[PDB]
Write a protein that binds this ligand. Structure first.
Ligand code: RW4
Length: 835
């Protein structure tokens, strides 16, 4: 039975656990046991929560960032149901009470308090409970805007408890620092050099040193000594040694990095063999500090770590043993001349006292290649007041490589609400890539939070699982997933069911790719349907939680509605229905295989954020942040938005449609008039107008380029949205400066199909201005989030030039005033550009 579990984990994570063992490694071996402990105790806590608490773990509320309402309620065993009039201001308890009083009369009354129940959304993994107005609940909202009547089910507490039950599991060393560079094993055309250097973060702890010029063979021999311009007793606990190997007459060949203190803080010695990574300013301090696992093909560099006695980096305990100014004027870019830094350092007790939020600026002027300077910084750190989340996020960057610091950030991040934490999860994962060691505060934090909230849990898994084909993080992520599963047996089973669907989806897609190159779509579609109709398909692809959103259930797959697009990577359109969920169960997914959805996922998340900030301030721009999740190697899912189309498509202005325009510009409006007759039209134009304003501003600020009519969509409701985001930050395909954009087809619709409507247009103008100004108030939030993502190795997000795009598009350089004028400048341009 333990064997079975183990083998299912292996299948889930996509890498056998025997591959962990066979490395014979203390770091790994300790990670696995210590974490297993951690996670299982979390299982223990969970399996004894109160029923409500369980609900919060297992189906977290989905909330919003008056008038009368129709609701249909039913109880768990019967199909008999009741349809109340309720108030959107009513608490769920009120509704439950009504449902009880209705139960008690039909079924003549005993009768059992409302506080025993929770309302489940029919045919979804969603519930409604807690002291909230009914329309604070996302699902309730959905229905309101879209006409529909809420279908809920009274679930008694003991039913929930049955659920909970079924899911049970030294400064003494002054000499300079030297290594020996012996030899290697590898390929090129000339002469070979290695250069070395010591980094603490992006910072060099002294001048790098080079190798002497050796002939271009395959098994080079230096046997060199290499002494660095720092004392040994100075090295900071996080000192990072970096090499680059290249040829010369420059040809980069490979790189390699390691920590100088092992993970139990022992200064390392003596011999290391270094299995290097292929080669893409040659030095790469950010890159993984574990070696290439391709040990039969990686160039290897043997080095030697001299002995100097054993020596353990000091305990904190020891570390801790060791004018009327203008400093404010300097305290507001953040790059600064030398005297300026010396000031900060001198003033550092004042910064802790009267500018606690300047921690970061101080960490950067602090002298990490001087142990003394480090101990006082730390001294100060140990009594430093906690920081707001936004400063914490700043601290997570590569620039702050020290563990004590790392830990203080987590210490500030702990007050994250589950909803905020979810908003940043993508970033906190990509950051694991910077970790020096396996066992770390962050991982523990992520594991702890995942284990306490099944949705964090769900998405952590997929973020991790989607990078398994990436050698440099295969080991770390595989280990984290493993831990996670030890903490959740039942979830592991739910997630396997998802991997299986994915798997078949991959098989089905490959067959589609083949069949299509030997026949007509119609023919291929009928084949697709047949292969789907096989039991093993029918069964694998049905009854699962959607990896795009676990609260959506994909019940029965409607084969007659499935298809593929005949072009490119042949994506799959797979549709579901569910008797239980009624209309709400009619959902679809799109399976893409051959593209990289990572950058789309990032963009749509910045758009989701943008919406939340706008909403937090009372502006709902009617955005469509649809689900998009990479799940494997150039593989992932995209949520289907029903009742929508592409602009381009509506503009094929095909005869014998409702939309038959005499002039092409009418096409778009014709279509809305057909989807929104008589009185309904006014609504749709308004929707169109708000969504258009959001996407105008989000695409501008993000530098989303390559925008055709075939990657912009409208919903029958009026809402316009952008899809397919493959180039951003001006990086259209090299790097331009996309203007604000404004299609004339849209200005037509905003103005209700009239040539002048300054009235309607100048509203629109305001929307834009507003959406724009709010974003700016959270400029840093974007800056810090985009900074953390430089870790993903997204090729359109590599460097300084990339994030620059944002500072500018947001003009965080200018003031509340001059930003807005400057904005209007590029708005009227875009305007007069509309022919
Ligand atoms: C026929 N109508 C409705 C179905 N339709 C589509 N059928 C497809 C069949 C197989 C594969 C993809 C299809 C895409 C569409 C149009 N379309 N494209 C998308 C879409 C959305 C996002 C997205 N991101 C990428 N990187 S590619 C991509 C494609 C889409 C969506 N999310 N929801 C609903 N319809 C969508 C075109 C217009």
């Amino acid at each position: 039975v333990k064997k079975l579990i183990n083998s299912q984990i292996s299948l889930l994570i996509g890498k056998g656990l025997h591959e962990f063992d066979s490395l014979r490694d203390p770091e790994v071996n300790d990670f696995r046991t210590k974490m297993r402990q951690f996670c299982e105790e979390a299982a223990a806590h969970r399996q004894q929560l109160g029923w409500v608490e369980w609900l919060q773990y297992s189906f977290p509320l989905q909330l919003e960032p008056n008038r009368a309402l129709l609701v249909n309620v039913k109880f768990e065993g019967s199909e008999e149901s009741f349809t109340f009039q309720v108030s959107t201001k009513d608490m769920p308890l009120a509704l439950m009470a009504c449902a009880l009083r209705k139960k008690a009369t039909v079924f003549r009354q005993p009768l059992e308090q409302p506080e025993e129940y929770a309302l489940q959304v029919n045919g979804r993994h969603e519930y409604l409970y807690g002291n909230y107005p009914l329309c604070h609940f996302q699902y309730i909202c959905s229905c309101l805007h879209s006409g529909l009547t809420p279908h809920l089910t009274m679930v008694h507490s003991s039913s929930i408890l049955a659920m909970r039950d079924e899911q049970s599991n030294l400064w003494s060393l002054e000499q300079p620092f030297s290594i020996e560079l012996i030899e290697g094993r590898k390929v090129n055309a000339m002469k070979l050099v290695v250069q070395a250097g010591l980094f603490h973060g992006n910072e060099m702890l002294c001048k790098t040193v080079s190798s002497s010029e050796v002939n271009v063979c395959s098994e080079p021999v230096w046997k060199q000594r290499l002494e660095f311009d720092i004392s040994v007793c100075d090295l900071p606990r996080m000192a990072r040694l970096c090499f680059a190997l290249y040829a010369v007459v420059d040809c980069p060949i490979a790189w390699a990095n390691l920590m100088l203190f092992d993970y139990k803080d022992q200064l390392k010695t003596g011999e290391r063999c270094l299995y290097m990574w292929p080669s893409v300013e040659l030095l790469n301090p950010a890159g993984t500090v574990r070696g290439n696992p391709n040990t039969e093909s990686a160039a290897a560099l043997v080095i030697y770590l001299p002995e100097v006695a054993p020596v353990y980096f000091p305990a904190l305990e020891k570390i801790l043993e060791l004018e009327e100014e203008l400093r404010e004027i300097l305290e507001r870019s953040g790059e600064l001349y030398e005297h300026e830094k010396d000031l900060v350092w001198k003033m550092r007790h004042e910064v802790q006292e009267h500018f606690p939020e300047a921690l970061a600026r101080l960490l950067l002027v602090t002298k990490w290649n001087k142990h003394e300077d480090v101990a006082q910084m730390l001294y100060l750190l140990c009594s430093w007041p906690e920081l707001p989340v936004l400063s914490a996020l700043e601290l997570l960057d590569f620039s702050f490589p020290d563990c004590y610091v790392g830990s203080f950030a987590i210490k500030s991040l702990r007050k994250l609400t589950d909803d905020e934490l979810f908003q940043y999860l993508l970033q906190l994962v990509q950051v694991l890539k910077y970790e020096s060691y396996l066992d770390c505060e962050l991982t523990k934090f992520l594991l702890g939070r995942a284990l306490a909230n099944r949705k964090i849990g769900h998405f952590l898994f997929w973020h991790l699982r989607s990078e398994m084909h990436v050698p440099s993080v295969a080991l770390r992520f595989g280990l984290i997933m493993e831990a996670y599963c030890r903490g959740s047996t039942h979830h592991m089973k739910v997630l396997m069911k998802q991997g299986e669907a994915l798997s078949k989806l991959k098989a089905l897609n490959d067959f589609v790719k083949v069949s299509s190159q030997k026949t007509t779509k119609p023919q291929t579609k009928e084949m697709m349907h047949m292969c789907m109709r096989q039991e093993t398909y029918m069964e694998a692809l049905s009854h699962l939680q959607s990896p795009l959103d676990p609260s959506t259930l994909l019940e029965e797959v409607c084969v007659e509605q499935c298809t593929f697009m005949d072009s490119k990577m042949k994506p799959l359109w797979i549709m579901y229905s569910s008797e239980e969920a009624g209309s709400a169960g009619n959902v679809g997914i799109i399976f893409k295989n051959g593209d990289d959805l990572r950058q789309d996922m990032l963009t749509l998340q910045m758009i989701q954020l943008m919406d939340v900030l706008w909403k937090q301030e009372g502006l709902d721009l009617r955005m469509t942040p649809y689900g998009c999740l990479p799940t494997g190697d150039r593989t992932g899912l995209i949520e289907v938005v029903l009742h929508s189309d592409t602009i381009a498509n509506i503009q094929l202005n095909k005869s014998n449609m409702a939309a038959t325009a005499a002039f092409n510009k009418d096409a778009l409006l014709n279509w809305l008039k057909s989807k929104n007759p008589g009185e309904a039209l006014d609504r749709a134009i308004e929707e169109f107008t708000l969504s258009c304003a959001g996407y105008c501003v989000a695409t501008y600020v993000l530098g989303i380029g390559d925008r055709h009519s075939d990657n912009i969509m409208i919903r029958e409701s009026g809402q316009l949205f952008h899809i397919d985001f493959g180039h951003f930050l001006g990086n259209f395909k090299n790097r331009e400066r996309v203007p604000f954009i404004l299609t004339y087809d849209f200005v037509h619709v905003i103005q209700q199909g009239k040539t002048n409507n300054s009235e309607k247009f100048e509203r629109f103008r305001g929307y834009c201005e507003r959406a724009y100004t709010i974003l700016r108030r959270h400029g840093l939030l974007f800056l810090h989030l985009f900074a953390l993502m430089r870790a993903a190795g997204l090729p359109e997000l590599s460097c300084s030039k990339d994030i620059q795009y944002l500072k500018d598009s947001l003009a965080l350089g200018k003031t509340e005033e001059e930003a807005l004028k400057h904005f209007r400048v590029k708005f009227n341009e875009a305007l007069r550009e509309s022919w």
